[PDB]
């Protein structure tokens, strides 16, 4: 029964991993080269093999190698080496670390391309700078400031991705979650490796010492007590593994949904995967799971201004216009247009508004008529 339960749990883990990696596998991609991102110094994501962020994340987290090359060989001469003393095998992962590297490379070289058109039929590997241009167009920032303010936003994005390397500490809640997940696996194995010393009412934890000290009629009861304790411990471990695997599968489905929503495409959901209005995301592996980081918009230095709901002619009240992805702003340098997330007063044209049905609620105007 215990072998059946562990085999079923491992098969569930394996095909859940296979399903998640099949879903995240992009159709088409561009090769990763130096100069990726152009002016953006995003080469930390670029792997030159795992990525530098991935290797730094492996280094900064207390991880013991699961003896896949010389585990018994290092046990010949010198916690992972304590694998047989209780009796258990840590299975190797279903995918190679190089297979993870190939998947992460595919996502990093394809995320610039997939994020331009609805539907995954085509692939659109535009240079990364123009991808950011179109994504910031998508959030409601006018093309004038993007045409005029490339250098400062490039420096802002670069320093934003450069600030997180020194933030690799307790403040990163993601590292805290990775750490106690790894600690959860470690203490789950330590439950097996430690409870052998428990006696459960017996006088010694060693069966051989029991048979070498005692007479058979009482060691029958002693061995029975200790094996009953060990079987109850193993049944509790089976239940713990089952509920942990079920939670892992649910989290895997959630991760697949998240990478299918705001990685391959630009989402609009309020803080579903990025606090603030989301712009882009990036994805790497993690020593137990999957690590996500997201770059989003954060406004500052807000100002209050006066605005309307629509411009209508006094002589022709039927002709009414409404702002498209923006607002109608009265400058105090006579109306003008502003974007939905930045203060950029610019003269109102036909390419940013839509003709709309008239109401009393808008403002009649007959002096400075927009085109």
């Amino acid at each position: 029964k215990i072998n059946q339960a562990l085999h079923g749990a491992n098969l569930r883990q394996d095909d859940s991993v296979r399903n998640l990696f099949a879903s995240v596998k992009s159709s088409q991609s561009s090769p990763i080269i130096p100069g990726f991102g152009g002016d953006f110094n995003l080469t930390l994501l670029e792997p030159v093999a795992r990525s530098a962020i991935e290797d730094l994340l492996f280094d900064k987290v207390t991880i013991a190698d699961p003896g896949y090359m010389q585990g018994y060989d290092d046990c010949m001469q010198q916690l992972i080496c304590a694998q047989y003393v209780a009796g258990y095998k840590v299975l190797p992962p279903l995918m190679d670390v190089n297979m993870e590297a190939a998947y992460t490379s595919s996502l990093l070289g394809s995320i610039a391309g997939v994020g331009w058109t609805a539907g995954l039929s085509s692939f659109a590997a535009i240079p990364f700078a123009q991808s950011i241009f179109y994504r910031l167009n998508g959030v409601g920032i006018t093309q004038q400031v993007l045409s005029e303010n490339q250098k400062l936003i490039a420096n802002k994005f670069n320093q934003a991705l450069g600030a997180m390397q020194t933030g690799f500490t307790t403040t990163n809640e993601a590292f805290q979650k990775v750490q106690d997940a790894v600690n959860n696996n470690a203490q789950a194995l330590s439950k097996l490796a430690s409870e052998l010393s428990n006696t459960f009412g017996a006088i010694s934890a060693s069966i051989g010492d029991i048979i070498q000290r005692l007479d058979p009629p009482e060691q029958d009861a002693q061995i029975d007590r200790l094996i009953n304790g060990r079987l109850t411990t193993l049944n509790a471990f089976v239940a713990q593994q089952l509920v942990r695997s079920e939670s892992a599968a649910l989290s895997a489905q959630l991760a697949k949904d998240k990478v299918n929503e705001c990685v391959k495409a630009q989402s609009k959901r309020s803080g579903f995967c990025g606090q603030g209005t989301h712009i882009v995301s990036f994805v790497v592996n993690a020593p137990n799971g999957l690590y996500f980081m997201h770059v989003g918009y954060y406004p500052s230095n807000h100002i209050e201004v006066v605005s309307a709901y629509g411009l209508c002619d006094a002589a022709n009240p039927t002709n009414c216009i409404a702002p498209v992805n923006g607002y109608f702003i009265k400058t105090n340098n006579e109306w003008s247009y502003t974007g939905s997330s930045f203060y950029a007063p610019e003269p109102i044209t036909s390419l940013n508004t839509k003709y709309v049905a008239p109401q009393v609620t808008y403002q009649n105007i007959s002096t400075n008529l927009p085109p």
């Binding site: 088409q28 991609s29 585990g71 046990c75 001469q77 095998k89 190797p92 595919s106 010492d209």
Partner: protein, 470 residues
């Protein structure tokens, strides 16, 4: 019978599912045993080999318990002339351990040898020294070796030929019989060396001891060319703990340095188990000699050589199996181990291998049954781990391969105003089948009839438990 037998009995059927399975492990056999934590002391025979040996009526005693005695280092010192033993084999006193020993040494020439018998009635067997009736004994009549001066020779051999007690009437005479490990009263009045042959010794007896007078007669035999003497050993089996023992002749196979890097069953004088001893550096308290981990498992030990050692475990390798349905094919795998262990030092039931190349080193471990090949499989069915898989031949053994990565259709990110677009020119409709379990089987159980089955005494017993069914 084999791993597949255990796999079949695990599934309670003749048919199983193809895949990777964990069969019971095996253990490397212990290479031997080491016993080195506490050694005993040696028995003392220097007063036997030194000084003037007293006479046969003055046999001097050495008691031996809890000591080491080696007749190879002891009996070689004797110029052996006469050897007799009763109720014990001659080789047992040099080999078998005993509870306690008593050994009396006395002056005894070879001319008076024939009086040493228990059934004898001569003066030596009457007054001087009598053996043990109910205990096994051994008499050794030896000579001083010519290249041996540490022992000396007395002035003359002497013994008591007539010994008796006269009562208060002075007419009734009672001879004195010496028992085992006893002394005659005439020994008290006969000196350590009788002056000459036929000497008569006398003493007054106290009235409260029956009164009367005490008489004895002593006789002398002069020194020969070299002094001859006698040794008597009486063993005892139930008067002490079986502590006197010979040399512990295991100095070449029960030490730590003799069995480095090999699994042994240590018996460390109170601490026994299975493990591997390795030379290390002195850690922890050197005096306590026993260092353990947090989990009450010993990590090292301080031997008497001054060298500290670490003991980790008697560690072995688990065994896994890969099996395929509808092609009666299987192979064995040992993970996390170099290709170093072959069928020599086994345990548990047996091993399974057919179609007799064998050892194959993979990143998972060492695999028997596979064969190296340059194949790439993207839809593997039997995941061996990492990215390695095996594939049946549709009789032909399993083929090793790596998990084939499906490259996405590559497109070059150009650096100009133009752009290289990927567009599909053909299409299909794919059906994707999914199942969502929305309802478990609404089941009830009638508590009392399940737990009780309608017997009135049972419902009498279950009335006190009460609210569990509710």
């Amino acid at each position: 019978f084999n791993d597949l037998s255990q796999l079949h009995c695990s599934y309670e059927s003749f048919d199983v599912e193809s895949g990777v399975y964990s069969v019971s492990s095996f253990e490397a056999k212990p290479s031997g045993s080491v016993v080195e934590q506490a050694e005993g002391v040696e028995c003392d025979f220097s007063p036997l080999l030194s000084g003037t040996p007293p006479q046969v009526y003055n046999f001097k005693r050495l008691v031996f318990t809890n000591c080491n005695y080696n007749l190879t280092k002891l009996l070689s010192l004797f110029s052996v002339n006469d050897f007799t033993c009763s109720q014990i084999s001659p080789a047992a006193i040099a080999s078998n351990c005993y509870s306690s020993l008593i050994l009396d040494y006395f002056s005894y020439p070879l001319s008076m040898k024939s009086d040493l018998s228990v059934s004898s009635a001569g003066p030596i067997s009457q007054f001087n020294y009598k053996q043990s009736f109910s205990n096994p004994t051994c008499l050794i009549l030896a000579t001083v070796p010519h290249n041996l001066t540490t022992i000396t020779k007395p002035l003359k051999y002497s013994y008591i030929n007539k010994c008796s007690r006269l009562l208060s009437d002075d007419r009734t005479e009672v001879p004195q019989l010496v028992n085992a490990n006893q002394y005659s009263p005439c020994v008290s009045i006969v000196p350590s060396t009788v002056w000459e042959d036929g000497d008569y010794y006398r003493k007054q007896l106290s009235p409260l001891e029956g009164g009367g007078w005490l008489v004895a007669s002593g006789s002398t035999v002069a020194m020969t060319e070299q002094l001859q003497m006698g040794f008597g050993i009486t063993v005892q089996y139930g008067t002490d703990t079986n502590s006197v023992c010979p040399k512990l002749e295991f100095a070449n196979d029960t030490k730590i340095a003799s069995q480095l890097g090999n699994c042994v069953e240590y018996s460390l004088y109170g601490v026994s188990g299975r493990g591997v001893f390795q030379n290390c550096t002195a850690v922890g308290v050197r005096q306590q000699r026993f260092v353990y981990d947090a989990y009450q498992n010993l990590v090292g030990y301080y031997s008497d050589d001054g060298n500290y050692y670490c003991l980790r475990a008697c560690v072995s390798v688990p065994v896994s199996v890969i099996y395929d349905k509808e092609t009666k094919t299987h192979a064995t795998l040992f993970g996390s181990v170099a290709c170093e262990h072959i069928s020599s030092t086994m345990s548990q039931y047996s091993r399974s291998t057919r179609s007799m190349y064998g050892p194959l080193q993979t990143p998972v471990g060492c695999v028997l049954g596979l064969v190296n090949s340059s194949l790439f499989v993207e839809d593997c069915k039997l995941p061996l781990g990492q990215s390695l898989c095996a594939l049946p031949d549709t009789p032909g053994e399993m083929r090793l391969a790596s998990i084939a990565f499906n490259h996405p259709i590559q497109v070059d990110q150009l650096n100009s105003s133009y752009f290289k677009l990927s567009i599909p020119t053909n299409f299909s409709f794919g059906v994707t089948q999914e199942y969502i379990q929305t309802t478990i089987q609404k089941v009830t159980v009638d508590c009392k009839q399940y737990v009780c089955n309608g017997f009135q005494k049972c419902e009498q017993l279950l009335r006190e438990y009460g609210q569990f069914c509710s």
